[PDB]
Symmetry: C4
Subunit: 33 residues, 4 copies
């Protein structure tokens, strides 16, 4: 945690994974199994 910019990196990473997560489900709509 020496670099303060780490907080921005981790935050962006989390928001990035969650962004594609919701999007993927959105486009998929139905679970389809």
């Amino acid at each position: 945690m020496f670099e303060p910019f780490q907080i921005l990196s981790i935050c962006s990473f989390i928001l990035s994974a969650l962004h594609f997560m919701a999007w993927t489900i959105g486009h998929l709509n139905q679970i389809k199994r």
Copy 2:
């Protein structure tokens, strides 16, 4: 405000919260209460 990169961090954060804000409402469409 020692680090100049802070301006980019704060800006992104604000734009991030506002991005999900509009999106959430968009997907929700109706208030539903």
Copy 3:
């Protein structure tokens, strides 16, 4: 241009303005005048 991170800041800024630009038009659909 002393800070190299500037390139990432400027790029993100440009992509941010263009992102909301297309989105706004997308949601608006019709020009409506």
Copy 4:
């Protein structure tokens, strides 16, 4: 690779190009040729 923030820059760049890539196809829907 002297600057550690480079990893975040490269990652964002890749995710940015892939984001617009899928979006463009999404809006286009049909290939149209």
